[PDB]
Amino acid sequence: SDFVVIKAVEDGVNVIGLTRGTDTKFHHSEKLDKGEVIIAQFTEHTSAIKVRGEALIQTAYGEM
Amino acid sequence: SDFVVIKAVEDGVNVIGLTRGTDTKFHHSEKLDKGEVIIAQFTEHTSAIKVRGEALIQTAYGEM
Amino acid sequence: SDFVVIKAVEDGVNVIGLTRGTDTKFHHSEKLDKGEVIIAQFTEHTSAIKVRGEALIQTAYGEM
Amino acid sequence: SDFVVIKAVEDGVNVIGLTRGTDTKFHHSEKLDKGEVIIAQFTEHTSAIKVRGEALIQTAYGEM
Amino acid sequence: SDFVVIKAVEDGVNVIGLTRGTDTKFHHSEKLDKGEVIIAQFTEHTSAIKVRGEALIQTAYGEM
Amino acid sequence: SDFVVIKAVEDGVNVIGLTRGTDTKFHHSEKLDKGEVIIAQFTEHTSAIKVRGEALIQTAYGEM
Amino acid sequence: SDFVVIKAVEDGVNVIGLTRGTDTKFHHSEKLDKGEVIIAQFTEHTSAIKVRGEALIQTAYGEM
Amino acid sequence: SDFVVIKAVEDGVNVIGLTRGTDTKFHHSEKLDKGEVIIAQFTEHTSAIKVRGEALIQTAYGEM
Amino acid sequence: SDFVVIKAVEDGVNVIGLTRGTDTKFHHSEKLDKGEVIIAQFTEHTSAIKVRGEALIQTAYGEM
Amino acid sequence: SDFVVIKAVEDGVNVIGLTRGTDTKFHHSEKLDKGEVIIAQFTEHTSAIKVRGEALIQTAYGEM
Amino acid sequence: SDFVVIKAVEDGVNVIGLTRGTDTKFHHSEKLDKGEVIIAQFTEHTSAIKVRGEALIQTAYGEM
Amino acid sequence: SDFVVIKAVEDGVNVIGLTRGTDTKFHHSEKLDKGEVIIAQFTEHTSAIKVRGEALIQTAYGEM
Ligand SMILES: N[C@@H](Cc1c[nH]c2ccccc12)C(=O)O
Ligand SMILES: N[C@@H](Cc1c[nH]c2ccccc12)C(=O)O
Ligand SMILES: N[C@@H](Cc1c[nH]c2ccccc12)C(=O)O
Ligand SMILES: N[C@@H](Cc1c[nH]c2ccccc12)C(=O)O
Ligand SMILES: N[C@@H](Cc1c[nH]c2ccccc12)C(=O)O
Ligand SMILES: N[C@@H](Cc1c[nH]c2ccccc12)C(=O)O
Ligand SMILES: N[C@@H](Cc1c[nH]c2ccccc12)C(=O)O
Ligand SMILES: N[C@@H](Cc1c[nH]c2ccccc12)C(=O)O
Ligand SMILES: N[C@@H](Cc1c[nH]c2ccccc12)C(=O)O
Ligand SMILES: N[C@@H](Cc1c[nH]c2ccccc12)C(=O)O
Ligand SMILES: N[C@@H](Cc1c[nH]c2ccccc12)C(=O)O
Ligand SMILES: N[C@@H](Cc1c[nH]c2ccccc12)C(=O)O
């Protein structure tokens, strides 16, 4: 139930969930536009999140 | 039992629950108007929340 | 056992419980008048609360 | 486990327990007079508390 | 094991336990005099405590 | 494992344990004299403690 | 595993364990002299401790 | 796993473990000399510790 | 549920998951470019993370 | 998993583990020299630690 | 799920996992170069981590 | 779960794990040189750690 908050500062920001398991592949890519926010949990299927494109990011450890 | 608070600063703000599971898709979109607030938990079915349109957002980590 | 506090600043404020489950719909709408307060927990049946009309709201994360 | 404290600033303050379950109705209404206090827990049967009439209210999140 | 402390500032203060269950009624009323204190837990049978007459009250949330 | 500390400022102070159960009665009354202290837990049998006569009392919530 | 610390400021200080159960009686009285300290836990058999004679006392809640 | 630290400020300090159970008696007495320290846990068999002779004592609650 | 945040200050930064088990090898290498971020959990399969190339790193213990 | 840290300020410092059980005896004595440190846990077999000779000691409660 | 962060200040830094068990031997040695970081957990197989060569190290207790 | 950090200030520092159980003996001695660090957990087999030779040591309780 750990999560991350991501706000796209500029258009065309991209958020990628990476599969948990022995295998590691991108299983979903959610596209974000200027101002749009996403709050994503880590889950049974997502053990890593990748962020392409200039965004603003909050995590338990702080702001990016 | 982790949640997010979202208040629409202007009209026509949109809040999107994304399915938990192997698959990731929008299963519900709740529409908000100027001033209206929504407090949403993450749940057995919602592992990520998306926010289209200019809103004010609180999360465990702070304000957006 | 997480909850929210909602006080109506003006008449005709509306508080909506949204069903927890695969489905998401309004199952109850409680109407509030100037000054009246409601303290509502999230529950086996309510995984999100919506607030129509100008209210004052406290949550774990702070005041709205 | 969670509770709320309510003190009636003026006469004829009213405190309403709302049933927990699929259904949501008032199951009890306890009447309070100037100065009288009530400390009420959320319970197996009460998942939301409503307060009609001008009162002073403490919750985990603070004073109202 | 959550409790409340109640000290009667003036004579004839009254402390009322209200039944936990589907039903809500007064099952015990303990009377207090000037200076006398009572420390009462919420219990399997008491889910709300009511205080008639001018008292000083401590709870988890603070003084009232 | 919750407890209360009670010190008699003057002679003839009285400390009363009240039965936990559907029933509520005094099951023990321990008498205190000037200076004497008692540290009492809440227990399987004591769900409320009453204090007659001018004492000094500490609880989790502070000094009385 | 809750405990209390008691130091006798003057001679002939007395520390009394009171039985936990439906019954409440003194089951042990340990005698303390000027300077002698005792650190006593609450236990399966002791649910209240009484202190006769001028002592200095620490508890979870503070100093006496 | 709660413990106490005892350092003898002078010679001939004495540390006494008292039996846990219905019965309460000294089962061990460990003797300390100027400077010598002992760190003692409460245990399945020791529910109270007594300190004869001028020592320096730390407990969860602080210094003596 | 422990995680690390890694942001590439310059192009061609590399993030390597190392297998948990008796054996220790690289099982995945995710490539990062200027600005791109990755939030990675430790998992059933990743017990150590290696970071090649000039990055900015947050962990529970702080910034690197 | 509670422990103590002991550093010998001068030569010939001695650290003694005392048996946990109904019986209480020295089962091990580890000898320390000027500068040498030992970090010792309390364990299934050691419920008290004794320190002969001038040492520096850290515990959960602080420095000695 | 306790871990250590290690960043090589200079080239040719070496990070060594030591086997948990009755036996203690080096089972893996991961080599680090100027700037490269490694975040390593203690695990079912690694109960001690050794760091040869000039590095910067974060642990639960702080920086070294 | 608990660990200690040890950095050798000078050459030829020695770190000794002592067996957990009724018996207490050295089962491993790991040698450290100027600058080399070791982070060691307490484990099913190590209930005490000894440090010969002039080192710098961090523990939960602080620096040595
Ligand atoms: N499938 C991998 C994905 C992953 C998680 N954390 C990582 C850190 C680095 C590289 C890959 C990963 C896993 O579940 O473990
Ligand atoms: N169905 C996905 C949805 C998701 C959660 N967190 C994410 C982060 C990134 C991308 C997708 C997701 C899941 O339950 O895991
Ligand atoms: N029925 C949905 C309701 C919901 C909860 N949180 C949300 C966030 C966004 C959209 C819908 C929701 C659920 O239980 O998950
Ligand atoms: N019967 C509903 C009552 C309720 C609790 N929280 C709410 C929030 C909004 C509206 C109704 C409710 C339930 O148990 O869930
Ligand atoms: N019998 C009710 C009493 C009660 C508790 N909290 C309340 C709040 C409001 C009204 C009634 C109550 C119950 O156990 O739930
Ligand atoms: N027998 C009652 C005693 C009690 C506890 N708390 C109270 C508060 C008010 C009045 C009575 C009580 C019970 O166990 O619940
Ligand atoms: N035998 C009583 C003793 C007791 C504990 N706490 C008290 C408070 C007041 C009076 C008596 C008591 C019991 O176990 O409960
Ligand atoms: N045998 C008693 C010893 C004891 C513990 N705490 C006390 C306080 C007072 C008097 C005696 C005791 C017991 O286990 O309970
Ligand atoms: N396979 C190893 C990987 C590892 C984790 N932590 C380490 C520290 C140092 C060296 C290797 C490791 C393990 O699960 O334990
Ligand atoms: N064998 C005793 C040792 C002991 C622990 N704590 C003590 C305090 C005082 C005297 C002896 C002890 C026991 O396990 O309990
Ligand atoms: N195999 C040993 C390794 C070890 C852990 N901590 C230590 C401290 C000192 C010496 C050796 C060790 C063990 O699991 O316990
Ligand atoms: N074999 C002993 C080692 C030990 C741990 N802590 C100690 C303190 C003092 C002396 C010996 C020890 C044990 O497991 O308990």
Short mmCIF file of C-alpha atoms in Angstrom, two decimals, chain H residues 1-7 27-28 30-32 35-45 56-61 63, chain J residues 2-4 6 18 20-22 24-26 42-43 46-55 57 59-64:
data_model
loop_
_atom_site.label_atom_id
_atom_site.label_comp_id
_atom_site.label_asym_id
_atom_site.label_seq_id
_atom_site.Cartn_x
_atom_site.Cartn_y
_atom_site.Cartn_z
CA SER H 1 11.93 -7.64 27.63
CA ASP H 2 11.78 -4.61 29.96
CA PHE H 3 14.90 -4.05 32.02
CA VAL H 4 16.63 -1.95 34.67
CA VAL H 5 20.21 -0.73 34.93
CA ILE H 6 21.83 -0.51 38.37
CA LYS H 7 25.30 0.88 39.15
CA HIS H 27 14.96 -16.11 44.89
CA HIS H 28 18.23 -14.39 44.07
CA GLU H 30 23.31 -10.43 43.50
CA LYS H 31 25.93 -8.35 45.35
CA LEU H 32 27.56 -5.29 43.75
CA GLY H 35 31.50 0.92 40.17
CA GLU H 36 30.08 -2.51 39.19
CA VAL H 37 26.92 -2.44 37.04
CA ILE H 38 24.08 -4.88 36.46
CA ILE H 39 21.51 -4.85 33.73
CA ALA H 40 18.54 -6.97 34.63
CA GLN H 41 15.47 -7.88 32.61
CA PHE H 42 12.14 -8.78 34.15
CA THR H 43 11.52 -12.41 33.30
CA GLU H 44 9.26 -15.44 33.60
CA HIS H 45 10.55 -15.69 37.19
CA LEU H 56 22.33 4.72 40.59
CA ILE H 57 19.32 3.35 38.69
CA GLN H 58 17.97 3.73 35.16
CA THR H 59 14.55 2.53 34.08
CA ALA H 60 12.27 3.09 31.15
CA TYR H 61 10.90 6.13 33.03
CA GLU H 63 17.01 8.07 36.41
CA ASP J 2 17.42 -5.84 23.41
CA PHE J 3 21.14 -5.28 23.84
CA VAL J 4 23.87 -3.45 25.75
CA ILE J 6 30.18 -2.16 26.91
CA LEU J 18 23.57 -14.67 34.13
CA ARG J 20 17.63 -17.12 32.63
CA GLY J 21 15.43 -19.69 34.39
CA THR J 22 14.37 -20.51 37.95
CA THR J 24 20.48 -17.75 38.49
CA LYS J 25 24.20 -18.33 37.95
CA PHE J 26 27.14 -17.07 35.87
CA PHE J 42 19.72 -10.55 26.05
CA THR J 43 18.86 -14.02 24.90
CA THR J 46 20.96 -14.56 29.35
CA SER J 47 18.43 -12.50 31.26
CA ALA J 48 20.93 -10.33 33.12
CA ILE J 49 24.38 -8.98 32.46
CA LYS J 50 26.88 -7.97 35.15
CA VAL J 51 29.89 -5.66 34.62
CA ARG J 52 32.94 -5.90 36.93
CA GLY J 53 35.70 -3.30 36.44
CA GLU J 54 35.61 0.29 35.14
CA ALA J 55 33.76 0.34 31.80
CA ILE J 57 28.08 1.30 29.11
CA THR J 59 21.74 0.87 27.07
CA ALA J 60 18.37 1.73 25.65
CA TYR J 61 18.04 4.18 28.57
CA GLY J 62 21.36 5.93 27.93
CA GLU J 63 25.02 6.13 29.00
CA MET J 64 26.45 5.04 32.36
#
